[PDB]
Each structure stands twice: as structure tokens, then as C-alpha cells.
A paper describes a structure:
Each Cap monomer was comprised of a canonical viral jelly roll built of two, four-stranded antiparallel β-sheets, with sheet one comprised of β-strands B, I, D, G, and the other sheet comprised of β-strands C, H, E, F.
Five capsid proteins were present in the ASU, with the unit cell comprised of 480 Cap proteins arranged as eight icosahedral VLPs. The interactions that occur within the pentamer are comparable to the 10 nm assembly, with each capsid burying 1,934 Å2, mediated through 22 HB and 4 SB (compared with 1,660 Å2 for the 10-mer assembly). Each pentamer interacts with five other pentamers, and every Cap molecule within a pentamer interacts with three other Cap molecules from other pentamers. Two sets of these interactions are identical and together bury 3,390 Å2 (through 52 HBs, 4 SBs), and the third interaction site buries 774 Å2 (mediated through eight HBs). Analysis of the electrostatic charges on the interior and exterior surfaces of the particles revealed a highly positively charged interior surface, and a possible additional interface for DNA binding. These positively charged surfaces are distinct from the positively charged ARM domains, and mediated through dense clusters of internalized Lys and Arg residues (R46, R51, R100, K102, K105, R109, K154, K155, R160, K163, R164, R167, K169, K230).
Numbering used by the authors:
A (entry chain B), B (entry chain E), C (entry chain B), D (entry chain E), E (entry chain D): 42 to 247
The structure:
């Protein structure tokens, strides 16, 4: 039971997602996209999970997204195919489309994988936290950097000036779809595979 | 034909299960759950099974639950996915939910396994009987303990002050589900793989 | 991440203990004794520890008691020697002496180990939970039984009719001492080495 | 004599520490704690050390804390035992207790190590600098990350907009103690084992 | 980084395709067909792709066509089978039928592979650019030749009197279908696997 003792937990949460009936540019093929990011706090605040953990540091080795249709949608009712893409930086926010796309906005990505709208998808990835760089050629601007291996660093749960280590946003997976003729509802399940370092007491009483 | 002669039987029973049309929080994703426990008497009292066995002891090596839809439900009509979980103590009783859950109540369990509402599931487990402990730090309260291996102990069919050995409750499997848009009926089949020890006569005449 | 996934934690708590100045049978050698038992709940209720754990079962592999003098007592100030003894059943309650003993009440025990009053002691043991036996030759009486190996069974945290699995009392260590000429205060630290089985969600919302 | 030429130095500083006579809840066992962090500037500003170094980068491979009693305190006068803990993030600041603790606030830590109040302690550690993350799920908040190996990065002594590279705070070691019956004064010695990269000139004249 | 440095990219674009409800020769089996050709410019003009590439030469090593039904068409709804055929010259233009065929117009082709109307198809091919021959036995007529291996030649992006290297038409894939009883809409995804030679600057400023 040393300072560097490691523990590994699996955490999950679920939510609903809707792809709306096509009501624009009717009769034509259009695409839209959304995305998901991963933060430990998102999973600890879920009702059935432990809301605090007695560990000093953590690191997300792996994340999983699984979206499957519900609401009585027929799997054999073909509604075309879109793509998933692993986007491991904050650029992913641009891929929640605010306007109809005339092409699949994620298909050109290296690593883009096809998925059929009526079946959903399942994909694993290594989501990345974003380290800060403030020394840019333009003043008063910052950029990001992320590490190739999760074993390189640790995120303290209560480190930093906000004690908000569990809220670090790890990027990230996006998914696109051709707009269907009828609304489709999905059940989404996210999973985190997290390593924790150093069992720790509660903060001292004040 | 010694005192420790062993016999093995397979026992089964069936019953109907209903997942009700969602009539609460319509438009939201909600989850509920139920559970099953195993007792030898539950199977011997089934109509087509032998209602009494001429053995002195028994032990349940393995149990099995299969739930498949009926009532004309389409397997290709997707209604999301829930989870099954092996819960081998009386805590399982809390997982027959009495209120709608905003998250899958069983997914966080180690060993939780996904299953699709429209296809049902099949799972095998080693259900455990609960040994009594009455020496707790709070007076007049009791707790439970179960044994890691079924080969460790035997249960007399007629042992104890009530001769109710066959009614020992073995835990246990729970299953959760997102509430669907229509009612779904299932056929559930349970199977016990039971070892019996010592062929025995009837009780003496009185 | 299976049903049988195991985790191991170290838990500790501390408290003060006093051996009072001898005020009886003055000038003569007398002995007294006290004892300690181990319950998981005792450690989870300690301020700096997690007060609930999200595991389904547990088992105490090892327990440790360490009592050391404080309050400015000189280690080189000899006050004789007493004994520690591992007593793994409820008989230990008789060894909190209510009357002065003319002999060391724990020395005859097999496994009794000497300890010097002015230095304290440190001892590891395997504490035992007490399984119930109610079939005795005398009516309306029960007795106990404990298992040789901790790997034999599991205690569900919320199992039993009281959901008080963490309050099972594990026996046990006692310690005796010759009554000193002046009061001595000690700091006692207990440690549990506990294996937990099956990461589990919170109980469903009601 | 290349750009990546490395030099290693040992640096030290000392200071006094006091554990105060217990004047609150007299008669009860209470605990308090304090902590130490490491910054190169803390050592260079010490009177007998070089106040500026002609190197471009540095990295702290190892740090060391030794606290031994003084003021005439007897080592054979027992005052119980507390614990030391390696806490490598800014959470350590909470472990300078501002209120009396009823339990040892550091004992539950993985890696916690006992130490006797009357003898002091000595412990080595790998203290960590905190890298900034500004992309959290809560807007305008930040968190930290540190690297598992000191060989992964270098800290420029004069890098950044403030040329304050030597002031990076490396975490960290905390120590707890039961409050004694009399005041105890200590001499604390800290030691840094620091690698430096690239012998460098003074800044150009202006 | 030599003149012959090669880069390889994957490029994709999508569009809609309709097979119209049969309104001619009703009650009888009829067939129609269409075709696709490949030009780098077709993919660079697509909205999400880079519209200019800074390379000197290119060559298409592989092309892919995937057409899948959408619009709510049931995959389990049989509508017969047609064929795909790789036609690597401009004769393919004749196989966009302008009159109903009483036989499958592509089935006789060597390499013809059947596909079911209700599931779509996926086929890979090596599309061919057409080299000009003007020396024919008939005056003022020209013919075509293509090379067996893609490694034999390179197409400069801006070569020729029109700088229209990216507009070379590569042949080619055709697909036939028996006319269904109801209209069927498809999503079509084309993919190019293109090797580029010699990273190049922009054209000089004028």
C-alpha cells in the first residue's frame, strides 16, 4: 500500500438522443452531426454512481460510446449511413452542426467509420485532456497540447486553484447522420475505464 | 451406494413477465428493474415436476434464466437495451424498482451485461444461500454470509425446526430495462442444476 | 470487470486508552485486561474515511492493533510486562476485567505474547466472524462457529434482514497489564486489510 | 559541452517547527497536521546558498525532509505517533489543519508512514510540478496535471512571462501528529537533488 | 524529401440516387442501369474536402462505390437483384439506359456481381484514365488506351494546356436493377485512394 498504488474502475452513464425528422430541403440528401466528450465528474454525478471517490489522482485510459435505437424503430428499416470520428481536441465543438450539410461532415476524417442510422454504433477511443500553452505569436491567446500516452501523467482529483480535477474535459467522439424521413430516438451508454492512484482520506474537518 | 452417494438433476419452471408501456414522464428516458431468486421448493411445486424428492441433502451448483419476448412483439423493433446483474445477497430486493430511475440502475455493477429489450436475454449464474450471523455491533441485529464454493456445504431437505430446507432462498439475478413505448410480454424459463446426496426413505408412519 | 472482481483496501482508525494508577491492594501485584474487536462499520464511520463503499461483498483478511504510550511517559521507565492474546470468539468479553486479578489473566493462552507496559505492543491477527448455530442440546440457546480461511466466504455489505453486513463483529485481540504506580495514556491505531467483491451502484432511487 | 549537457547539485535549507502544547479539548486525543512544498527559489534565497545559477533549465529529481526534535526534549519521553504522507498536488494545502481533528488526518493515505513525535522523521519523495489545464466542463475554471517521470520535461529557470521558473511549486509532503502535553520544537532540514541543463551566460547588459 | 516523394490520401463524397417506381410495361420484368466515373476534381470540389492540393502529380490506385437504401425502405422487403460491372472505358456511357431492358444489361459482363435491390452493394475497382490515340484507319477519329498498372504513369495536377489535370475521367463502374414496384432512395458514398507525388508551392504571384 504505497503512494503509487493504482486502482481501476469501470464507470457508465446513459442518456437519450434524437435525430429529428427532415423538415428542410425536403427531398434532398442532407447531413448533420453532434458529439460527445468525457469528464469524470459527468459520471460521478450520475444518480447510481458514487458521487465522490477517495483517491488522489486519476487518468482515463479508455472511453466507450454505444448508441442504439429505441422507441420502436425497426432495425430493418434502412435510413442510410453516417460516420463516427475520433476528434481529440476542442475543434470537435464545430461538428455539432448548426446548418444542414450537403456532404457528410465527418466522412473525410482519417479513422472515420461508417455506421447505419437504423442500427446505431459502438466505438472505443482514448480521450485526451488538453494541456495549456499560452506562448503564442498572437498576444492574449492560448492553445492546447495533449499527451500520446495516458501513462505519461496523472490528474489530481482536487488539484488546481478550483479543486475541479474531475471536471477536466477529455476529447472526444463525433457522429454524423443523413437526415431521416422520420424521427429516431436512441439510448446512449458511455463507459469510462479509469485508473485511480493513491487511496486517500476525506479532507480534514474545519 | 454409500452415505455420500450423489445424484444430479435438472429442474425447470416458467412464468410470464410484462414490461409496461411508459405512462410516466412520457418523452424522457427512464429505467426500471426486477429480479429473480432461486429456491428448490419453487421448482418442486411446479405442476409437471416431482413435488417431493427422496434425498437427504441438496446443493444448487448452477442456475439459469432465459427471458424471451412473446405476444407478437417484433425482434427487429428496437426498444433500447438494459442490463443483467448477478446479485448474490438479499440486497437484490431493492432492485425491483418502486420508482422510475433516470439511469440504468444495474449498469454500474461489475459483471453487468447488456441485453436488448426486443430480444430478451439468457444468463447462467451460481446462486448463493445466505448463512446467518447474529453477532453484530448493534444488538439484536443479524447479517449474512455465503460460501464461495458450492462444494463446501450441503443443505438437508428436511433439516431445521421447520423441515423447510427446500425453501432456502438462493440469490440471485436482476435485470433492468429502459421503459418502452408499448407493453412487451415475455416467457421466462428458469433452470436449476441441483446435486442431491443420499437416497432416503419416506418419513416413518405414525 | 466480472461479478467476482476483487479490490483490496487498507483502513485505519485511532483512539486513546488509559491504564489507571493502582489505587487498590496497594503494594501488591495485580493485573487487569481489556480487548478490541473489529467491524468494518467502525472504520467507515471514522471521520477521515469513506462512510459508504460501493462494493457488494467484503471479507477481512487481516487486522492490526498498535498501542503506544503518549502523554510524556518515559519508555525507559519500566512498569513490568503483560500479555496480548488472540481470542477469536465472543468469550473475549470476559477479559475486560471487572475485578483485580492476582495473576496475568492472558498469559496461559496459547499464542500469548509478552509486551512491556512502557513500550506498548504491535500485533497482527486474522479476526473471525461468528456464524450462528441454533441446534443445541438446550432449548432456546445458540452457539457460534467460525471458518478457518477467510477465502471460504463473503459478507455482503447490505445483506441480511437489517442490511447491516458492515457491522459484523470480528474477534479479536485482548491485552493484559500489571497495574502501574502512575497513570499511563496510549495512542491506539487499528488497521484492517479488507478485500471487497463486485463494484456496485447506489441503491435505486425510491 | 553540448546544448543538453547536464549538471546535478544538492541544495539544502533549514527552519524551526513547533508542535504546541494541547490547550483545547484537554483530556481528549486530537490530531493536527502541516505540510511542506519544494521550490528551487526557496533554496537559492537561503543565506549560504548561491542566489543565482547560470543554467538554462532544471528539474527536481528528488526531495527530502528530516525533522528532529530540539529544545531539550527527551527522545525517551513518548508522545505517541502521527504519520507522514506524500501528497503531490495542491490538495495538500488543506492538510495544514485549521481545526483539531478527532482522527489522524493522514493515516488513511496509501503510502502513509508512522513516525513518533519524540523522534521526528526522515522521508524522501519525488515532488511534482503542476501543469495547467484550462478546458473543464465548468467555464473559466482550471485544473492540474503532473508527469509520472522527471525525465519527461525541463523547467527553464527564466522561462515564461515573469522569468520565474525557479518559483514553480513542487508537491509535496505532509505530516500529522497527536497533540502533546508540552510544546515540542524541531529542527527541519530540507534537501533538493536537482539536475540542471545547459550552462548559460548572464543576461546581456542593457 | 526528394522529387519522387509520394503521399497517399483517402478522399470521399456522397450523393443521393433514386430507382423509380415501375410505371412502364407494368406486370413485366424490366431492367435499367446507370454508372459512375471518378475524377479527382469531383472530390476536391466537395464542400468538406480541400479544394486545392499542393502536389505536382497524382494517380488513383483504387476506387470504391457503396450504395445503401434510405428513406425507410425495408431491407427484408425483396425487390430482386441486379448486377454491378467494372467498365473501364467510355463505352460505359451507353449503360445509362434510355429505354427499358427486357434482360439485365450488365449480367453478361465478365466480373459481373449480383446485388440485391433492397440491400445495396459495395464494390472496389481500379479505375482507368484514357490515353488518346489519333492514328486510326478512319480520318478525323480517335480512340483510347489505358495502362494495366497504376504504377506506370503519373498525372500532373496542372499539366496540359488547360491545367486541368485533376479533371481526368477515370472509368468506371455500372450497376443494373430490375424495376421495383415502389420508388427506392439510396445514399451513395464514393471513395478514392490517391497517391500524390512531390509537395509543391503555390503558383508564383503575378
Amino acid at each position: 500500500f504505497s503512494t503509487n498504488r493504482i486502482y481501476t474502475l469501470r464507470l457508465t452513464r446513459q442518456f437519450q438522443f434524437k435525430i429529428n425528422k427532415q423538415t428542410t430541403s425536403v427531398g434532398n440528401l442532407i447531413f448533420n452531426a453532434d458529439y460527445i466528450t468525457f469528464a469524470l465528474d459527468d459520471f460521478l454525478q450520475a444518480v447510481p454512481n458514487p458521487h465522490t471517490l477517495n483517491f488522489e489522482d486519476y487518468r482515463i485510459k479508455l472511453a466507450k460510446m454505444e448508441m442504439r435505437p429505441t422507441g420502436g424503430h425497426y432495425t430493418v428499416q434502412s435510413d442510410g449511413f453516417g460516420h463516427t470520428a475520433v476528434i481529440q481536441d476542442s475543434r470537435i465543438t464545430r461538428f455539432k452542426t448548426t446548418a444542414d450539410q450537403t456532404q457528410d461532415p465527418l466522412a473525410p476524417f482519417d479513422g472515420a467509420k461508417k455506421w447505419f442510422v437504423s442500427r446505431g454504433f459502438k466505438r472505443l477511443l482514448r480521450p485526451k485532456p488538453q494541456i495549456t500553452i499560452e506562448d503564442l505569436t498572437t498576444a492574449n491567446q492560448s492553445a492546447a497540447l495533449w499527451l500520446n500516452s495516458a501513462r505519461t501523467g496523472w490528474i489530481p482529483l482536487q488539484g488546481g486553484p478550483n479543486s475541479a480535477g474531475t471536471k477536466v474535459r477529455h476529447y472526444g467522439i463525433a457522429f454524423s447522420f443523413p437526415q431521416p424521413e422520420q424521427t429516431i430516438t436512441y439510448v446512449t451508454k458511455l463507459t469510462l475505464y479509469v485508473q485511480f492512484r493513491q487511496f486517500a482520506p476525506n479532507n480534514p474537518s474545519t
